[PDB]
Amino acid sequence: SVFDIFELTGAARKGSGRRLVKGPDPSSPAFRIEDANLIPPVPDDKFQDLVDAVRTEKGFLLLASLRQMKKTRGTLLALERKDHSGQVFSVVSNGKAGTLDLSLTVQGKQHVVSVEEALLATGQWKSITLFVQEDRAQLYIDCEKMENAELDVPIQSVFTRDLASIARLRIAKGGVNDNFQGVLQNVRFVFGTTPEDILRNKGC
């Protein structure tokens, strides 16, 4: 029902890619990224559960609290091929374009869509609620007007049955100079819940 990515990676391990810091959630640890390459990937079996949940729902709700350096491109999370030939999926807070970029690669074909009006790199804590279902993307920043975008392919087409055997979930690690610069907290995949239910318990 709820997959906190940092928890899964076991992210809290002494000084391996990040510094444990303060977050807007007094009850959870926040990580200031230092070397995303060192933050361990989500374990295969623990990733396999996410895959199935996504496949059951034909989508997911992703929540995240972030504090990102201005005008930078930071990968929130990505699915990288075990062979290292690239990524099959990624979510990037693009501070250069003022967007949240969603990339999906379906056997060679990579498709990228930008959710416009998404300034998440304003050096302060921001919280996002991204709802994805089939080929539809809905984004809510804090308590603001929702932004929408269409995927050229259904999200589940990326989350194949065997995905965990050929790819792994990484957090804060990008492709071309896209590692996340800043602080991340409660990056979680929530299932069996629509976006309204969530914003309903943030001042709105």
Next chain:
Amino acid sequence: SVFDIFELTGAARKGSGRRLVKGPDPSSPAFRIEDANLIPPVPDDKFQDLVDAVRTEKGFLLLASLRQMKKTRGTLLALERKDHSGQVFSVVSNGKAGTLDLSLTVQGKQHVVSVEEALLATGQWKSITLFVQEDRAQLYIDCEKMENAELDVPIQSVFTRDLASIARLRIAKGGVNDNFQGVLQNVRFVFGTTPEDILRNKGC
């Protein structure tokens, strides 16, 4: 019933005397001390509650997980006079003597007792359970033989009705070069519970 000192001080505040790190308790934050002087004292009202609990019980059970530099003297916690003329109470892991020193000052008269056979400064995580009642002190390190010591005065005689108005609870801050050097976690005063109940749920 339970007073976690770091929580009370609001100890978790961005980089004010300590670095948030890993502890043997996966569910709680551990603090590596950097400048105890900057770790805020326990708020008066929140301290007033501790005082009354101690006064009701005529003692307390103190628990603590610590990782202390070898052969150093580190104050785990202390009650310092608001006027700055000294301490009225202190608990010191004395790595030089291999003891846990308990100091109590009752109007000028300072009394110090050492709980012998207490090597807590062996550079590794150690956990302590100190039970104090009236003038009796009992210490249990991890799951080891208990050590005992007698106080020249009842513990409640230090915890007067008005103590919170003339003194404040500090953590990791000592008197004569006694700041704690290392990492501290779950330093808590537990009430309405005897020591056995505690060790009963650590492998012993």
